[PDB]
RNA sequence: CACGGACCAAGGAGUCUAACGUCUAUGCGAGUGUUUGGGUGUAAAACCCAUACGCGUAAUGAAAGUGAACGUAGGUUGGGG
RNA sequence: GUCGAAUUUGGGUAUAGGGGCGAAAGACUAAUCGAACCAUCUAGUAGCUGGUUCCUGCCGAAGUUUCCCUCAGGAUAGCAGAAGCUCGUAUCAGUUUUAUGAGGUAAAGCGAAUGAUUAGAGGUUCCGGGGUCGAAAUGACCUUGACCUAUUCUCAAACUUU
RNA sequence: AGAACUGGCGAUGCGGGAUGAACCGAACGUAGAGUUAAGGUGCCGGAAUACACGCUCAUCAGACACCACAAAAGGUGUUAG
RNA sequence: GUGAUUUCUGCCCAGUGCUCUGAAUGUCAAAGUGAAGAAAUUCAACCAAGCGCGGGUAAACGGCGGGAGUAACUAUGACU
RNA sequence: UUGACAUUGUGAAGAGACAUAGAGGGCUACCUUUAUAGUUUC
RNA sequence: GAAGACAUUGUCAGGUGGGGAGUUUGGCUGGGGCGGCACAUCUGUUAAACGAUAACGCAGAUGUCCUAAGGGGGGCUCAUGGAGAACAGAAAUCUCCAGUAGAACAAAAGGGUAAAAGCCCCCUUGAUUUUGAUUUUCAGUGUGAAUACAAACCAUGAAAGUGUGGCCUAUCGAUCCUUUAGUCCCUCGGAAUUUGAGGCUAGAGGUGCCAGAAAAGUUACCACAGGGAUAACUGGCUUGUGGCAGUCAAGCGUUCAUAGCGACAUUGCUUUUUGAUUCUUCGAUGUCGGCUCUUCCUAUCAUACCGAAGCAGAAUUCGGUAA
RNA sequence: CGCGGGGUGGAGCAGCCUGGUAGCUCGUCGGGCUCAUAACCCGAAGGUCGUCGGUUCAAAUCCGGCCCCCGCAACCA
């Protein structure tokens, strides 16, 4: 879809508590780390013998994901999140639809 | 002319190899039946070319 | 014209255990439970016993924690006696 | 059929179970082979089949809901019994009456909307197609097509005023 | 084959439909008397070869719901319009 | 693999295999090396075999199909 | 099958990178670079 | 003697690895397979005027799309018909009259909507934040969707008010894990500090068999527990189809409907075709055909006796009693 | 999925690294050549250089994102 590059939501910053500007950026998950209890438990569980020990998911059915608009307040830097409806093509770059022009 | 339990080449509604009979060096005992490690095959056309 | 049964005798299949729910009966009651163990014995019984210990009397929070009366322990309504 | 040899056979010996041996049939390996036999694990597991033992009395069902790799199974609600508990004729009822609502089925309707559908009648084309009089005309005449008006015959589960 | 409402069989005998899980009647402790249901009353077979008005003769008659089949089309057969 | 003798064994290495050069800003493990760190650690370059790339091979496993234009009756196509 | 470490010691040539010096290009960073009193891998 | 600190031997790591090992290889279903999705869903109808309600019943639709097609406000009125204007005609643009929606409002369809919910212009993010209640499906669980509120921060408009996504009914996702935002709080339990980690509240990564295992074939070498809950014989219900038979009479038959035929229709019968079904039988009723032998039926090929002819005779055709 | 490359007339390859005018082969046409036919030569057209943006005196080219394809490796919801 198409969303602006600036967005004005109610803020929760314990000093703002009002409408302040925010900066929108489509959310990327983030590099998975070790040293989280799930990974370390997985490593010991995989090690040795026994083959695979946890399921691996093969019957994928969906073709989209949910685009996450994470917001950054320009006054107090308190970052917030919102979730969108499923879509195929999303892009932050905002160009506005014109109706007078032809197709 | 065998049964699949008895040989790689056995089985099938017709007498045939099914897969390539040219077998690799790294093949294991049980898989090495046929033309071991062949560089070429067919009919010997040409000289030794050694 | 679905299955078992030719006949007879004898055997033959919802039990025991650890932990539990409801109901019931019994005792004592903010307590409760002698029998791990100790004493004793007519001796695997019967009888007696401390310290402990579990459950209840306090719960709510992941937690660090905090912790049960404004009042005749409230008002209104219905209530057996 | 073969019958002087890829011949027949005794004794010895070697080869042991996912192993042997196989001129190849999954054949043979002690009447056992597409994985021998013996004991043990082992009362192996079965949503499936079969059976499941004395009498009388009282009560008395279900094949239906939702979820489940769910469809010969379970869980769950319901139907049933038992124990009762608090009260003592009432905040009751597979019923009627009165008053007030709701509904779009049966019927009905198409000279009402939508859709379908029979027949002619009357009109208009600067603007349908043709034949006649015309060099042509927004000239005229006859016919066919649609168009309009007032009618006419027959209809609808996904049409309808009522 | 699949549904709706209700009643049933399953789980249920008894009288009746000859016979039958489902129809009709009626639901059941052990007996006696009386009266009935549905069905019946020539004989089998308990009960009128009852009474009354008509119709039908069939050289394949007809004879009681569920239910155990018969149609279009025809007949100076016969009856009534 | 085929199955005496006789005779002949045609075309196809794209695919699956097999096998060879390694002339490599391709990929790539453990170790080892460097940077940041207070360390656990993170990052980065580098890097064997193998794969990938490029040759050979069908008496390896196998495969041997369409379409268009054409010859002076048509039809058909030696030709393209 | 391939690599690494250990078994596992004793030396020279060529190549690769660091700390002493250095001619030519950008007070003082680097390349064409060359012998090391020294450290390092093929 | 050869090789030589390389082989070899030991451990770890990457590739290869049906030689071998273990395992898996949906469901519904007029039997299974193929097909399809009736599996998660949505509109109209079946549906029998509350609700509910089945079929692999009927016509379809969904895994999306939209920074506006979301929110607020203002102005205007649509489709179409008629009459007119240079090029300009049936379709360009312009004017008027008529015009209850006969247009449009993303898609499927049904409701709804006209000084709007339609078309154009202006401003903005109310598609925001905090947790509760409630409707639907229902177990009065979850999920999705929605309703009306309460406490903040705003948008628009003069203001009243409206605004918690899309005019409504579909448009979607638990546990564990990982990861992000927030709280910068609790814990790391002999005492401290700092990284690291674990906790707390709200999101994301997804299970389409959609209340959500991690999963390829073959068996004609086969096995077991069962099923007549389920197919392939017979039998039973049915008779489309098969076969046979009627009624009517436009016509053929030179002429003439009916000697013999007979269109368009229509009414039946049979169970000697094949279907449809799934009642019996899967702790088994021996599934082709022929041979042999008996008996039964009539819808009669011959033989008996007859009726009719487009029957001169001959031959033949139609029909009756007759197995 | 982590890294990496490619997209140029109707079809197929050079030109990318060089930042400076887009070349060649087949196809189409016209002209030339031969007394003709064929063949052979020459010229016209043919690639928004996949799309958008940035950098530069200047971008098909270098870089970022997107569409498609390809290579190795990886993958506990
Ligand atoms: Zn703020």
PDB file of C-alpha atoms (C1' of nucleotides) in Angstrom, chain B residues 1-3 6, chain D residues 22 24-26:
ATOM      1  CA  UNK B   1      18.312 -61.468 -14.256  1.00  0.00           C
ATOM      2  CA  UNK B   2      17.858 -61.206 -10.486  1.00  0.00           C
ATOM      3  CA  UNK B   3      15.506 -59.939  -7.822  1.00  0.00           C
ATOM      4  CA  UNK B   6      19.758 -59.790  -4.504  1.00  0.00           C
TER       5      UNK B   6
ATOM      6  C1'   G D  22      21.788 -69.381  -5.214  1.00  0.00           C
ATOM      7  C1'   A D  24      18.340 -66.659 -10.335  1.00  0.00           C
ATOM      8  C1'   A D  25      12.449 -69.847  -8.862  1.00  0.00           C
ATOM      9  C1'   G D  26      12.692 -65.163  -3.895  1.00  0.00           C
TER      10        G D  26
END
